[PDB]
């Protein structure tokens, strides 16, 4: 009906997508063998959106799995939900990109994209009515930042009348797991801002903070952080594959949250989050969900929203639940925090209501939000890039593969224009 193609690049994109294909398989009641074992029939009426039918009742996921280093695909098949992925969808190279944007884009990631494009185009024609693309990667690496932005470029020039929903794991200063990623961050937002319509910035420091103070777990491994991300992955589009009373697809979110062709950088959220030891003492109510969507503690990006002003906010609700309490409290948070929203546009909040909550919960709410506090997210990368390009360091790895030094100046120039426009409209 409205099919979404999922693309996975980089090691971070492969791990999150492996968690993403696990949650929606649990939501639709699909065992790791490939059959369907559920109770309600509503999980079967809308099944072609995320899964493809095969003979014998076997369901296969419509996804593309790409990475030059074949290290992570051995772990993907060895995981709990790894038998369902198609071996024709496992496209890999021979040598890793080595944390270099040059090798990931123009030398080693330049001949594998022919093989990636034929799998993507084959799965595109298999769909009945294509709805768009969602992709996951990391900006701080070589394969995900390199081939991800390459694949964004090559698909946008071939499918113009579609949408791109990018879930990018942006680097953090204190959780800096690389020393060269200022180069890769600046050289990927050049390709991101011109060929994407909706981009979700995810940080690791925000997720480590949430699992400490909100969930209260002392061992937050990557098998848990990807679960928090995968909740927002499955909650953004829950009105596309389930009934409700006020439905909203990804294009309706795009036209309600993107007023300008360059102001399309978001900040996600998910807020029925409780610890195990405090489940008994909390009332699961619409007022308590509304309270904890909007605080700075629950945002999945390392930015304080109170240092800036929101432009647009959208909330997607799930569950059998009222509407006056939704409309009053979304109006109440606008009236109380009047200084936290810009005054030149009214009704900044979009609401969508569904019918089916996820398994093991009563009601859910997914938060997405455009804000001008992403200036602090990109100002740090600016100062990192300027102080690092000033002495021309970490550069022979880039000029030894074909690119001139002028592209570094253009990436800083594009990004300086991006922080000019948000400050102008704040």
């Amino acid at each position: 009906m409205r099919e979404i193609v999922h693309l996975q690049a980089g090691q971070c994109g492969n791990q999150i997508g492996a968690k993403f294909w696990e949650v929606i398989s649990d939501e639709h009641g699909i065992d790791p063998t490939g059959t369907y074992h559920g109770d309600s029939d509503l999980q079967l009426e809308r099944i072609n959106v995320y899964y493809n039918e095969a003979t014998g009742g076997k369901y296969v996921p419509r996804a593309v799995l790409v990475d030059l280093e074949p290290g992570t695909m051995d772990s993907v098949r060895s995981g709990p939900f790894g038998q369902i992925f198609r071996p024709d969808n496992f496209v890999f190279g021979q040598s890793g990109a080595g944390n270099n944007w040059a090798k990931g884009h123009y030398t080693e990631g330049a001949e594998l994209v022919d093989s990636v494009l034929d799998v993507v185009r084959k799965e595109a024609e298999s769909c009945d009515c294509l709805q768009g693309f969602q992709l996951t990667h990391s900006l701080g690496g070589g394969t995900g930042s390199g081939m991800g932005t390459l694949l964004i470029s090559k698909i946008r020039e071939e499918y113009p009348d579609r949408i791109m929903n990018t879930f990018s794991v942006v680097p953090s200063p204190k959780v800096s797991d690389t020393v060269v990623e200022p180069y890769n961050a600046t050289l990927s937002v050049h390709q991101l801002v011109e060929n994407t319509d909706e981009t979700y910035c995810i940080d690791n420091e925000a997720l480590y903070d949430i699992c400490f103070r909100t969930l209260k777990l002392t061992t937050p491994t990557y098998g848990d952080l990807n679960h928090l991300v995968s909740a927002t992955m499955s909650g953004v589009t829950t009105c596309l594959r389930f009934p409700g009373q006020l439905n909203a697809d990804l294009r309706k979110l795009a036209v309600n949250m993107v007023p300008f062709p360059r102001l399309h950088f978001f900040m996600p959220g998910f807020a029925p989050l409780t610890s195990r030891g405090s489940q008994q003492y909390r009332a699961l109510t619409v007022p308590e969900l509304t309270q904890q969507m909007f605080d700075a503690k629950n945002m999945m990006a390392a930015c304080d929203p109170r240092h800036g002003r929101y432009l647009t906010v959208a909330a997607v609700f799930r569950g059998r639940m009222s509407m006056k309490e939704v409309d009053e409290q979304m109006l109440n948070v606008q009236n109380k925090n009047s200084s936290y929203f810009v005054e030149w546009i009214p009704n900044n909040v979009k609401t969508a209501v569904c019918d089916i909550p996820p398994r093991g919960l009563k009601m859910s709410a997914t938060f997405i939000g455009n804000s001008t506090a992403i200036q602090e997210l990109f100002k740090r990368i600016s100062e990192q890039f300027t102080a690092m390009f000033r002495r021309k360091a970490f550069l022979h790895w880039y000029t030894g593969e074909g690119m001139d030094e002028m592209e570094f100046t253009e990436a800083e120039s594009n990004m300086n224009d991006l922080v000019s426009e948000y400050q102008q409209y704040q």
Partner: peptide
Amino acid sequence: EFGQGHTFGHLTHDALGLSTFQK
């Protein structure tokens, strides 16, 4: 309270002798 289509392949295909009502 205090007191207490089944398949995409089978829906687009295998429709020789069966109608939409028969499936």
